[model samples]
Target: QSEFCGHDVGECVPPKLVCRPPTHECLHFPCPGYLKCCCYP
Candidate 1:
C-alpha cells in the first residue's frame, strides 16, 4: 500500500471558493475585465 500526504510541489490550487461580485464600477468608456457597469440615480 502507498499513501501520499501534503507536500510542496510548486503548485497552487485554483481557488476552490471565490467571492461573488468581486468588483463593480461605472465607466464611460469600454471597461476591461469583469466590470459590472450600471447607471446610478
Candidate 2:
C-alpha cells in the first residue's frame, strides 16, 4: 500500500491536489505497529 494525508492508499489524485496537514498522523494497517491519529478539529 501507499501513504496519504487524508485519503487512504487507494484513491488516486493529481500531485497538485495532494494536500496533507503536518499534524496528520501515520496509521499502519494490520494493527500492532500501526495506529490512526487525527485532530479534534
Candidate 3:
C-alpha cells in the first residue's frame, strides 16, 4: 500500500494528477479522473 497525501491509498495515479492536499478536506482533487478521492478519516 502507498500513503497518498497522508491517507493510506493502496494504489494511485501519478502525483501530477494530484491536485492538492486538504482540498475541501480531501486529499485529492478531480476525483473522477483519478478513479477515487483520497480523503481523510
Candidate 1 residue 13 C-alpha distance from true site, Å:
26
Better of 1 and 2 by lDDT: 2
Query: Residue 12 in model 2: shift from native, Å?
Result: 0.6
- State candidate 3's TM-score: 0.18
lDDT of 2 by residue, 1-41 (tens): 65443444423233344325543333333333233433212
Write model 1 residue lDDT over 1-41, tens digit each, in one string: 63222222111122343324332223344445543343322
lDDT of each prediction vs. the true structure? 0.31, 0.37, 0.44
Candidate rank order under TM-score:
1, 2, 3
lDDT of 3 by residue, 1-41 (tens): 54454345423345456635553333433444535444543
TM-score of 2: 0.22
1 against 3, candidate with superior TM-score: 1
User: Candidate 2 local accuracy as lDDT?
Assistant: 0.37
Pairs clashing within candidate 1: none
